[PDB]
Amino acid sequence: NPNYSFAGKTSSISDLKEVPRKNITLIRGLGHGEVYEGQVSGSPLQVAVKTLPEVCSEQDELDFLMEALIISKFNHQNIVRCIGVSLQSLPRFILLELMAGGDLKSFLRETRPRPSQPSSLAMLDLLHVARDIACGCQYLEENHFIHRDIAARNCLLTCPGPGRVAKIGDFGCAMLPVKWMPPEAFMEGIFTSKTDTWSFGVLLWEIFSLGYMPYPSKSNQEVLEFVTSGGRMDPPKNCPGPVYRIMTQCWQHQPEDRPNFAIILERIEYCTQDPDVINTALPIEYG
């Protein structure tokens, strides 16, 4: 049994809300450990269930246990909740807030304006997603937790239609997310909250490009050398200046020159107030 500390409080496996296996039902798959839609009884509470393969290393179990603790201590509306766990039956379950809208990247890619739906997304939708994730990032900075993989693929959406809310919902050399990392993270291997400020800038790019891979025509090592020598991505198609300027400020070479999330939020709001920003048309992808 390992312990875990966060916001000054310590907790162990035994502090997790163990839900009885008999109160949990799986309805269908979602993704590939492996995750299911399901529901919990007292009308049923609708949940996502992440499972632990019964064939797994002793390290995998420990990581699963630890992950359960880590998620359970977060208390913020823009971070996917832990409903509880079912550890005492096999296979073991972690129970999470069901996010009906899926991951942000996939969502963006399928909702890119086209001739059939020319005004499916507006700038304000993108600024609200940006805002939601920054607010979560601000929670993590306040509480001294460094995510290390703030990317579109690791953010989830409550629903697809309007009123959607986005939330940090996943943890995420060849596996390292090089395109989301600042210079000082390959160089010295050091991490601070200004790490996440950088990755957020990249997230911004992803949001305003409507789901493109960052640094389009570039491999990991190419991006490393490019970024290390002070090179940066261009503005995504139709991207307003004020929004791009937030990205370039997130990508300052000097950690100390990057804004904290309070300042990021302030600047995402200003953007949200500017009519030249919010009246800009998103590009239509030609189908």
Ligand SMILES: COc1cc(Nc2nccc(N3CCC[C@H](C(=O)NCc4cccc(OC(F)(F)F)c4)C3)n2)cc(OC)c1OC
């Ligand atoms: C991405 O796949 C889908 C996910 C969902 N919805 C969903 N809702 C809740 C959870 C969930 N998961 C699948 C992706 C991985 C995710 C997970 O394990 N998250 C870990 C986690 C959870 C909460 C917080 C957290 O910490 C932090 F915020 F720091 F990342 C880390 C669990 N997926 C829905 C879909 O269709 C609508 C999907 O496409 C088929």
